[PDB]
């Protein structure tokens, strides 16, 4: 599908030194197309099979309106290392929550939240339907296409995306034994289910300005114990709450799927949605560094909710050897 | 003593030249990590760059705590320290702290979802968790946040314990003991033993024991297994609001665990019954557990060392940020590599 160009990228783009920021494998630089002088952004990855899959999948995703568009993909040597240079639609606006943060405040209303969430759910609906899970939907990957009001919200960063099996799930039954069943291993069940969990957690922050997470210090509430603390959640409809809850269902198979989500009235009928204001903009202001902790834990939680397929398997126990294992077996 | 900048994990990694091939790994949640080849030693190792180390007194203190521990933690089954460095040339330039640890490359969080573990797997895995636990408790440390994603395991089956800095936000408490969750009683080192129980349960089953949502839903699951408290233990409870929730509950007795985990090595169902117990003072200890039958293949009194506890060199000596950023700094330069 995608054709990767083999020429020097400098042939085509003036590769500026000014910096757009810092990523995982890449320091992203601003660039310009020579012929057309449009402005873009260049992201680098080291060229291996992991990098080519992120590349491939994010290619396929680029046809979606709410996913950041890949414009071109070069393979050049950069300082003697193979690399995929990836050229991307510039994303001016900044993170989603940094925006809502800054306000007149013209007030932040619940229907805005609904549009913002219909946006992301389109991005996610697109992916799942052609069988891709992003698996890393969080605040730092939802960026705006400019600082203007006419700005579109885009989903970026496929470092973790992967294709999965479209596989209708066990609608887990109402009556069940006291005793614990044998686990049927099937990792592919954490793929799409991870973006639904994401969808929940963001939607929750969107409507109050703080995570559904617990706190370390134990039971001025700024952490929903997966509950909806008044005043912020006083006004928010109870239908919305049922949503957040089906999305945050602990169980991957039991948890809400994206089309069930896109049908939900609070998204679909995004427009006759109660227009109540929300404390989000204000709370987000409140403590700056506390947001920073929201982001760190969202990231760690995503990390356990999804499967690292790039991990070692344990030998059958007998096939194993190590120091302690050889001391004990000796004496046994 | 010379470094080299590189762009990793939305940061800027200047690190000594002995560590090549930095390839990012992990979530990048709490400090980011990169795998590496260590020329000077020929081994493969991990290199984590702490995040926001000196942003607050909460954070500053938290970093000095964490460093102090890792410098003193020496043990086969707790994560040992291989080096620590810093690109600053004197307290002023100080801003970043990097750890280097031995690379392992899987944690039970992820293994439990890709592999069906055998009883022999579980014996040896939980054995190792208990070995380092015993050692840790000795130093008088309470791990406090022991979960499957905190336990690094490699393929030749060795296990190591990670990540102490609660010894903020947490997304679930599926592994914390009810004592520390609703703070009724106050707590033993046996809090950790509660987690070990849940972990073992999950290894044997492949399912998480108490996957709860809110603190009540979580609490209602715990009790569904271990039965509601008796007036005995309720006496030992702190709160008023806490006692009443209990009585307000359909009072149920503990169903025998051998009825629940059908097809488990009975010797293990038994050790479960002694870890997942509601009363702290009566919960089995790390030491006592090793001597349990399950671990017959692996128990060896003569090789289950303890640590010589270390102090409170400051810890609670309440100081400004520019303060800790110096005590930490010292701990950094004070470091001597372990035996080559």
UniProtKB/Swiss-Prot annotation, chain A:
There is a cross-link at residue 295 (Glycyl lysine isopeptide (Lys-Gly) (interchain with G-Cter in SUMO)). Changing residue 276 to A: Slight decrease in kinase activity. InterPro entries: Kinase-like_dom_sf (IPR011009), MAPKAPK_C (IPR027442), Prot_kinase_dom (IPR000719), Protein_kinase_ATP_BS (IPR017441), Ser/Thr_kinase_AS (IPR008271). Gene3D superfamilies: MAP kinase activated protein kinase 2, Phosphorylase Kinase, domain 1, Transferase(Phosphotransferase) domain 1. The active site is at residue 136. Activated following phosphorylation by p38-alpha/MAPK14 following various stresses. Inhibited following sumoylation. Specifically inhibited by pyrrolopyridine inhibitors. The keyword Nucleus applies. Stress-activated serine/threonine-protein kinase involved in cytokine production, endocytosis, reorganization of the cytoskeleton, cell migration, cell cycle control, chromatin remodeling, DNA damage response and transcriptional regulation. Following stress, it is phosphorylated and activated by MAP kinase p38-alpha/MAPK14, leading to phosphorylation of substrates. Phosphorylates serine in the peptide sequence, Hyd-X-R-X(2)-S, where Hyd is a large hydrophobic residue. Belongs to the protein kinase superfamily. CAMK Ser/Thr protein kinase family. This is MAP kinase-activated protein kinase 2. It comes from Homo sapiens (Human).
Curated annotation (Swiss-Prot), chain B:
GO terms for biological process: angiogenesis; apoptotic process; bone development; cartilage condensation; cell morphogenesis; cell surface receptor protein serine/threonine kinase signaling pathway; cellular response to ionizing radiation; cellular response to lipopolysaccharide. It is an enzyme of class 2 (transferase). Keywords: Acetylation, Apoptosis, ATP-binding, Cytoplasm, Kinase, Nucleotide-binding, Nucleus, Phosphoprotein, Serine/threonine-protein kinase, Stress response, Transcription, Transcription regulation, Transferase, Ubl conjugation. Dual phosphorylation can also be mediated by TAB1-mediated autophosphorylation. TCR engagement in T-cells also leads to Tyr-310 phosphorylation by ZAP70. Dephosphorylated and inactivated by DUPS1, DUSP10 and DUSP16. PPM1D also mediates dephosphorylation and inactivation of MAPK14. Acetylated at Lys-48 and Lys-147 by KAT2B and EP300. Acetylation at Lys-48 increases the affinity for ATP and enhances kinase activity. Lys-48 and Lys-147 are deacetylated by HDAC3. Component of a signaling complex containing at least AKAP13, PKN1, MAPK14, ZAK and MAP2K3. Within this complex, AKAP13 interacts directly with PKN1, which in turn recruits MAPK14, MAP2K3 and ZAK. Binds to a kinase interaction motif within the protein tyrosine phosphatase, PTPRR. This interaction retains MAPK14 in the cytoplasm and prevents nuclear accumulation. Interacts with SPAG9 and GADD45A. Interacts with CDC25B, CDC25C, DUSP1, DUSP10, DUSP16, NP60, SUPT20H and TAB1. Interacts with casein kinase II subunits CSNK2A1 and CSNK2B. Interacts with PPM1D. Belongs to the protein kinase superfamily. CMGC Ser/Thr protein kinase family. MAP kinase subfamily. This is Mitogen-activated protein kinase 14. It comes from Mus musculus (Mouse).
């Amino acid at each position: 599908g995608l054709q990767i160009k083999k020429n020097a990228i400098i042939d085509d783009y003036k590769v500026t030194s000014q910096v757009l920021g810092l990523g995982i494998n890449g320091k992203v630089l601003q660039i310009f197309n020579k012929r057309t002088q449009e402005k873009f952004a260049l992201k680098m990855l080291q060229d291996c099979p992991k990098a080519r899959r992120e590349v491939e999948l994010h290619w396929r995703a680029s046809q979606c309106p709410h996913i950041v568009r890949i414009v071109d993909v070069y393979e050049n040597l950069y300082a003697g290392r193979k690399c995929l240079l990836i050229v991307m639609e510039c994303l001016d606006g900044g993170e989603l929550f940094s925006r809502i943060q800054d306000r007149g405040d013209q007030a932040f209303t619940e229907r805005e939240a609904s549009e913002i969430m219909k946006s992301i759910g389109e991005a996610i609906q697109y992916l799942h339907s052609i069988n891709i899970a992003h698996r890393d939907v969080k605040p730092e990957n939802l960026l705006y296409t400019s600082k203007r009001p006419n700005a579109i919200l885009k989903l970026t960063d496929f470092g973790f995306a992967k294709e999965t099996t479209s596989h209708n799930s066990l609608t887990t039954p109402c009556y069940t034994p006291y005793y614990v069943a044998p686990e049927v291993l099937g990792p592919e069940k954490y793929d799409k289910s991870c973006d639904m969990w994401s969808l929940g957690v963001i939607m929750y922050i969107l409507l109050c300005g703080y995570p559904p997470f617990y706190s370390n210090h134990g039971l001025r509430i700024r952490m929903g114990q997966y509950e909806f603390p008044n005043p912020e959640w006083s006004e928010v409809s109870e239908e919305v709450k049922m949503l957040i809850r089906n999305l945050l269902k602990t169980e991957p198979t039991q948890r809400m799927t994206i089309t069930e989500f896109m049908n939900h009235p609070w998204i679909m009928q995004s427009t006759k949605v109660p227009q109540t204001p929300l404390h989000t903009s204000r709370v987000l202001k409140e403590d700056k560094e506390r947001w920073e902790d929201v982001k760190e834990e969202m990231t760690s939680a995503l990390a356990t909710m999804r499967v690292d397929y790039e991990q070692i398997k344990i030998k059958k126990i007998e096939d194993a050897s190590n120091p302690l294992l050889l001391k004990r077996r000796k004496k046994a | 003593p010379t470094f080299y900048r590189q762009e990793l994990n939305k940061t800027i990694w200047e690190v000594p030249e002995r560590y090549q091939n930095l390839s990012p790994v992990g979530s990048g949640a709490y400090g980011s990590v990169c795998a590496a080849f260590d020329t000077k030693t020929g081994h493969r190792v991990a290199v984590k760059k702490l995040s926001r180390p000196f942003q607050s007194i909460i954070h500053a203190k938290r970093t000095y705590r964490e460093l102090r521990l890792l410098k003193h933690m020496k043990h086969e089954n707790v994560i040992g320290l291989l080096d620590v460095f810093t690109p600053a040339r004197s307290l002023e330039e100080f801003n970043d702290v990097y750890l280097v640890t031995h690379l392992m490359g899987a944690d039970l969080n992820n293994i439990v979802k890709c592999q069906k573990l055998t009883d022999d797997h579980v014996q040896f895995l939980i054995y190792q968790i208990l070995r380092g636990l015993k050692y840790i408790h000795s130093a008088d440390i309470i791990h406090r946040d022991l979960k499957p994603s905190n336990l690094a395991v490699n393929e030749d089956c060795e296990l190591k314990i990670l990540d102490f800095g609660l010894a903020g936000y947490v997304a679930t408490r599926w592994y914390r003991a009810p004592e520390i969750m609703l703070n009724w009683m106050h707590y033993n080192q046996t809090v950790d033993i509660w987690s070990v129980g849940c972990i073992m349960a999950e290894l044997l089953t492949g399912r998480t024991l108490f996957p709860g949502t809110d603190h009540i839903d979580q609490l209602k699951l715990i009790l569904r297994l271990v039965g509601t408290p008796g007036a005995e233990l309720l006496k030992k409870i702190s709160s008023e609001s806490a006692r009443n929730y209990i009585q307000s509950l359909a009072q149920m007795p503990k169903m025998n665990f051998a009825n629940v985990f059908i097809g488990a090595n009975p010797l293990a169902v038994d050790l479960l019954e002694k870890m997942l117990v509601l009363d702290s003072d009566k919960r089995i200890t790390a030491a006592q557990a090793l001597a349990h039958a399950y671990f017959a293949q692996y128990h060896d009194p003569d090789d289950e060392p303890v640590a010589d506890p270390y102090d409170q060199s400051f810890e609670s000596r309440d100081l400004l940020i520019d303060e800790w950023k110096s005590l930490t700094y010292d701990e950094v330069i004070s470091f001597v590599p372990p035996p080559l």
